[PDB]
Design a protein around this ligand. Structure first.
Ligand code: NAD
Ligand code: NAD
Ligand code: NAD
Ligand code: NAD
Lengths: 295, 295, 294, 294
């Protein structure tokens, strides 16, 4: 296929290189002339600006640091829009703010142009080998059309279920993993302060929600089924967390996420949830966010 | 075997019931006379106090709400110690402060008495069916001796590797799972506020550290191998967490654990770890706890 | 008066010394024999245990690290209760858990003994000079009776208004000041990271709730009067706190209290309080604590 | 003087009204035509856009919700820069990100234009009466030049000491007061849950760092003098904060700022500061922010 690729950085350059290896014709643009020359050496055609890159391209891929730069590349001076066909598909593979994604897609649709969000998971090492995780936003039609192109850059495609849903599922995944790392560290350092070998804690946690998560263990048959009858009461969870913070404070292991979590359980007790299943914390957070109670 | 059981509550009563079902002779005590009578009706003998329960018992099991009550039952007026044989073994199956466990074991040893910590995982439904997770503290000799008794009450025994290591691994496991529930709720409510179906997020998270945990994914080949070369840089993790909190604050989804987690990443940046792997957060927390850097 | 003093530490020793200086007869006990000897040299009588110290004393003062030790000294082996007259008054000047204070007072009353809570503010340098802040719990009768004794050890007495109210107001004051220190540090370090001289910030904050507090500025005529019509809207407070956290995160100034505070304002916005006065955060916290909205 | 005023909202409209009352000639712009009409009725000249407002103005005032809108009004389509004289002075009175202020000032200087930051303290009622607190950033020359104009809108001018220092001191002040409100609420609700009348707590706190602040009480003679010898040891502060959180958790009073504060004191203990004065928390936060220890 005829592809424009705009943004030839640590991720963009290996992604564009993989597309060339699968026999696509690339017109490439980057403000860094050296990044263009390295792709021309691999078989790309250089463009002077995004509009030139987009002329007669079927797919236009952006891989840029932020939503302001995506907006400039699409709508700015000699932007993609000036060279773009109504039949072409823009694929933004950038990780940007989800509401910026929505406004870019809407602003494109208003001019008769098609744009989808396919941000990626995993590292620049995965970008090189073509083993990225593709979190495919866009319509069902756009995902079907883009799939052959996307599978040149990644090894696994998740259909996120609509325009702007790729950037949203990347955000939820990364929020959870990045914050989980900080909590994981508190548990591991408290373990070391107690002179418990870490392997013993990992062995036990691998068989509980501690190591498997709540999403598929504690939650499905309780809160997610509308049943808050207790397996593990909020009062007992609150008590055990109190003991963990008493130990941490005695042993000078700072546990900011633990301390914050206990005040969430305290709010749940204040709201009358003490004798509910611990999965009711999901309902407490939904109500705290101004959502309508489901149970 | 001849067994004393002290504490016949939601967990203690079914645990004692399972020991009777396997043919042991139980002498039972609880301050709630009705809980005694329910076990006497199943073939237990009554005791008027802990000292009477312990007289001629080989194993003495306590299942009590907190370490002050365990101490009172062992050392208080008409306590276990007054009726206890030096050949007998005390098994505290309570979830109590682990340094209280250490002091109880030491105080017992000073009087010539043997005590081990075997707290349990899983809930009262599992107590009824005899399918508790047994987190066995104590010496190798104590665990070997107790095992036949313990397997009446639980279906799986983990040898925690020493005196006080059962209560330690119970605390680390529960700390992690209890706090993880609050973080899990933030991610799920932010997902709902973004109009992304939860099952799509769970499908993505099931393949990453978000759903599998860091302990066995991100950590083993990086921080735990002494390698902090970046797969996912702390600077990029910190940036993505900032976007997640910007979105949450726009959508009024309160995320106290996420907010606290970003200030931990900010401290890591301040400490010069921005270009290190995100698994370096473990080292940041260790150094924050006054421990010597390993990397 | 005849006084027993149990606990002769950094605070207890100078407090007992001031009572001797005002002409009281003290019987003193501490598990640290050297602390007893220092007071005996100043004219105290040594006692071998709390019961001996209490024998024929009119006032019994405890100044101890925690409520378990106060309980042991009153009710334990050779405890005060074994030497205590029903006409005597026990004064716990310790900072302990307020519900432990309530139970000690009740347990003493059950045995026919009178006990009050009079913890103190200010530090060991004030204990030496007799310039402590006296936070007097107890009945009006107990405060009247104790006052002449207490004014040997402190320069200002606040009548906290009942049994257990002294330890309650000590806890609220210390909670606020101890946590406020951590927040103050975040503001000061963000100030330094921005290259703004601290003196300029303190000059501005001295004229606003930042340096004067909300209790007597923002709150009285708004939330405390039942009026949540906005002077400074929660939405604008939330926005400005977002900017502060953006700056802190760009400059790697860790601000855990600020970060936590923004999620409280976020909860207030979710509850529909965005266009209310910022003093409505008090009502948000009351509702979050399961109290009936005012 | 000839003044352009862009942003005629809750603050901007009364500020522009006070400039008209003091005899200035105003050219006004707001995207809300009704807000323009209210000022035109008081004698302002309407402008169709920021460039038109700025034409022949000596002073150009912006009072806008955020730094993106300030940038759009100055540099965007029909922006101030298109109508601006190199002899004119731009005054941003908005509360925006201070590093955005620095970049706006620098971007203006690059085009030969002069810009200063003068955000305001106090509320819309003060904007109406002309009694705002003026937090004047800019060079000494710019503050001197702007002062006569500024004193039409505010009653008190603080010279913050340089370009970008007005927005920095506004941000430190608001950060502190906004976060302090949430901590104040936790102390007040714990007070209610303990059945202690709030006025008794306020009376005690008004005499301590709890109600007076640490900046001018605890800090000057200790950390700010390089003296960390203890008046109130970090270990004792950490212990008392533990008791307050135990009580709050027993009484289901959520205290997220208190909880976060205890983990900062815990970090201080881990770093070897347990036996230092509580004012050493400032040094702990500085070191946590990657600053060189004092
Ligand atoms: N780096 C990772 O480990 C990783 C992992 C997964 C996803 N991501 C996402 O990938 C992106 C990071 O991209 P990267 O690492 O290639 O960044 P990079 O900074 O290395 O490359 C960005 C490129 O864009 C170019 N560019 C900037 N403005 C431009 C413009 N107006 N027109 C044309 N080119 C322009 C730059 O010259 C540069 O070559 C983010 O969106 C990030 O979240 C990163
Ligand atoms: N319930 C759960 O889901 C669960 C799960 C795992 C572990 N645990 C642990 O089990 C313990 C609590 O057990 P439970 O759930 O049966 O509690 P419970 O409150 O249902 O029962 C506690 C029993 O102890 C008795 N008791 C209290 N003081 C006593 C005394 N001085 N002497 C004798 N008896 C006394 C009470 O009367 C009561 O029958 C805790 O340590 C808890 O952490 C509970
Ligand atoms: N130190 C301060 O800055 C300060 C300020 C206000 C209030 N307080 C409160 O004062 C109380 C005591 O304070 P401190 O600074 O004097 O403590 P400290 O530890 O210096 O003194 C306590 C004394 O009690 C003695 N003691 C311990 N157990 C005893 C027992 N069973 N019988 C007799 N004596 C016993 C110890 O030997 C010691 O001398 C605490 O509640 C503390 O919070 C202290
Ligand atoms: N309201 C307060 O209590 C208070 C206190 C002190 C400081 N401030 C600061 O005052 C500033 C403005 O606040 P306000 O309360 O007057 O806000 P406001 O929302 O009431 O007014 C903003 C005005 O700007 C106008 N505007 C928006 N975009 C524009 C554009 N491109 N060109 C021209 N006009 C435009 C809007 O129509 C509106 O009239 C903010 O930075 C705020 O932080 C407010």
């Amino acid at each position: 296929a005829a592809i424009a690729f705009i943004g030839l950085g640590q991720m963009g350059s290996p992604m564009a290189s993989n597309l060339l290896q699968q026999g696509h014709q690339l017109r490439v643009f980057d403000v860094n002339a050296e990044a263009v020359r390295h792709l021309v050496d691999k078989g790309a055609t250089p463009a002077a600006n995004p509009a030139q890159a987009a002329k007669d391209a079927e797919f236009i891929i952006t891989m840029l640091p932020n939503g302001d730069l995506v907006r400039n590349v699409l709508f700015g001076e000699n932007g993609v829009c000036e060279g773009l066909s109504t039949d072409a598909l823009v694929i933004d593979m950038s990780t940007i703010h989800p509401l910026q994604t929505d406004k870019l897609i809407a602003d494109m649709q208003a001019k008769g142009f098609s744009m989808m969000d396919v941000p990626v998971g995993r590292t620049s090492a995965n970008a090189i080998t073509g083993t990225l995780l593709l979190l495919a936003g866009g319509t069902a039609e756009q995902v079907e059309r883009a799939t052959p192109i996307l599978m040149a850059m990644g090894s696994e495609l998740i259909n996120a279920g609509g325009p702007g849903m790729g950037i949203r599922v990347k955000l939820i995944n990364n929020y959870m993993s990045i914050a989980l790392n900080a909590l994981s560290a508190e548990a591991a350092v408290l373990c070391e302060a107690l002179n418990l070998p870490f392997d013993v804690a990992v062995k036990v946690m691998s068989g509980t929600a501690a190591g498997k998560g709540h999403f598929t263990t504690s939650w499905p048959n309780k809160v997610l089924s509308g049943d808050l009858s207790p397996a593990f009461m909020i009062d007992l969870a609150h008590k055990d967390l109190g003991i963990a913070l008493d130990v941490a404070n005695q042993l000078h292991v700072p546990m900011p996420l633990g301390a914050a979590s206990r005040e969430v359980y305290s709010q749940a007790r204040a709201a009358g949830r003490g004798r509910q299943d611990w999965s009711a914390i999901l309902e407490q957070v939904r109500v705290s966010a101004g959502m309508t109670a489901k149970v």
